[PDB]
Amino acid sequence: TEVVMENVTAFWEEGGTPVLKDINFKIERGQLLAVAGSTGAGKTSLLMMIMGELEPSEGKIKHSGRISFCSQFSWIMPGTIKENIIFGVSYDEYRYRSVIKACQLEEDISKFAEKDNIVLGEGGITLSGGQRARISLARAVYKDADLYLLDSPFGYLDVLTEKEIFESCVCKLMANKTRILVTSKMEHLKKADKILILHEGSSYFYGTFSELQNL
Ligand SMILES: C[n+]1cn([C@@H]2O[C@H](COP(=O)(O)OP(=O)(O)OP(=O)(O)O)[C@@H](O)[C@H]2O)c2nc(N)[nH]c(=O)c21
Ligand SMILES: [Mg+2]
Numbered sequence: 401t402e403v404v405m406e407n408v409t410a411f412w413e414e415g416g417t418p419v420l421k422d423i424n425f426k427i428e429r430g431q432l433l434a435v436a437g438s439t440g441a442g443k444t445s446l447l448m449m450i451m452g453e454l455e456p457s458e459g460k461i462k463h464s465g466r467i468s469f470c471s472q473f474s475w476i477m478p479g480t481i482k483e484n485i486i487f488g489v490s491y492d493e494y495r496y497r498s499v500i501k502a503c504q505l506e507e508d509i510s511k512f513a514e515k516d517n518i519v520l521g522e523g524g525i526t527l528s529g530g531q532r533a534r535i536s537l538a539r540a541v542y543k544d545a546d547l548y549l550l551d552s553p554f555g556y557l558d559v560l561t562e563k564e565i566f567e568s569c570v571c572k573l574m575a576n577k578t579r580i581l582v583t584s585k586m587e588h589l590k591k592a593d594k595i596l597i598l599h600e601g602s603s604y605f606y607g608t609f610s611e612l613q614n615l
Contacts (some may be wrong), residue, residue: 402547402578403427403450408459410449419445421601423459425594432579433588437598443582444472446598447549450580453469462514465546470543472552472582474529475537481509485538496542502569503538504561505531528554535563541569548574550581563587 408423411478413511423484435443446452451461454553476484486496488516500506512518513523520535527535534567540550544594550570566588570581581588590609597604605612 401427402429402431402464403433403580404460404462405446405449406460406565408449408456408461410454410456412445418457418601420449420453420598420615421603423596423598425596427580427594429576429578431593432575432581432591434592434595435580435582435598436595437585440494440600441598442601443598444551447551447580447582450547450549457592460535461543463547466544467547467549468540468545470537470540470551470553471556474555475592476521476527476532476535476540478519480517480519481505481535482516484520484535485542487539487543489543498573499538499542499569502565502573503534504565505534505538508534508598513581520600530558530561533557537569542573544580546578548577548579550579552582554583559585566591595611 404425405464408420409421411418424445425433435446444486445454446470449456449461452468470574471615472495482496485499500509509516509518510563520527524532537550540548543610554565562585568577571591594607595609
């Protein structure tokens with residue numbers, strides 16, 4: 401197993417309301433876990449526990465190795481689009497190009513005369529929300545890691561572009577990698593190896609899409 405939570409409960413504030421309550425799941429190496437639930441359900445807080453930023457008050461957690469995290473809030477730093485995606489990791493042309501194709505960024509980049517050297521974050525280009533989201537996702541996917549934590553990464557995308565990038569990036573390009581994707585979309589839940597739906601900190605459902613259909 402690469403990631404396990406067993407009977408996990410946690411609090412952000414000593415003696416507040418628990419942000420996660422008796423949570424259970426397991427992901428084997430290379431699988432995809434979909435994490436769903438309404439705002440404030442605890443999805444980002446669950447990822448923070450995996451990243452060691454929130455400690456359990458009850459229960460056990462297993463994970464090892466390097467993490468790459470994609471925030472639900474896209475961001476860019478001053479530098480070229482290539483520098484933003486590689487973000488300090490060593491460069492490889494094939495890997496970089498594979499990521500930007502999987503993220504549909506090749507189309508955007510081909511329209512600038514400076515191509516991958518277009519400068520972001522310095523008052524020239526103002527990117528759209530969807531462009532900034534795809535760059536943020538590409539940054540997280542380019543990094544080599546044992547576990548990818550993708551927190552609602554499809555912000556501002558129309559539903560067909562979201563579907564296409566889910567399929568080319570999260571399912572195909574990342575097929576061999578352990579992934580946790582925070583997402584609400586039916587096709588993502590259907591393609592995941594497991595689904596965890598959170599509601600106000602609790603496990604509303606944990607199992608497969610097939611199991612849920614049989615209910
Ligand atoms: C991300 N985060 C959330 N909280 C609070 O933890 C509770 C669960 O908040 P959440 O951010 O985990 O919910 P979720 O990611 O499901 O919501 P969404 O992104 O809108 O879809 C809420 O009370 C937050 O205010 C947080 N509280 C502290 N103290 N530190 C944090 O980093 C933090
Ligand atoms: Mg969140």
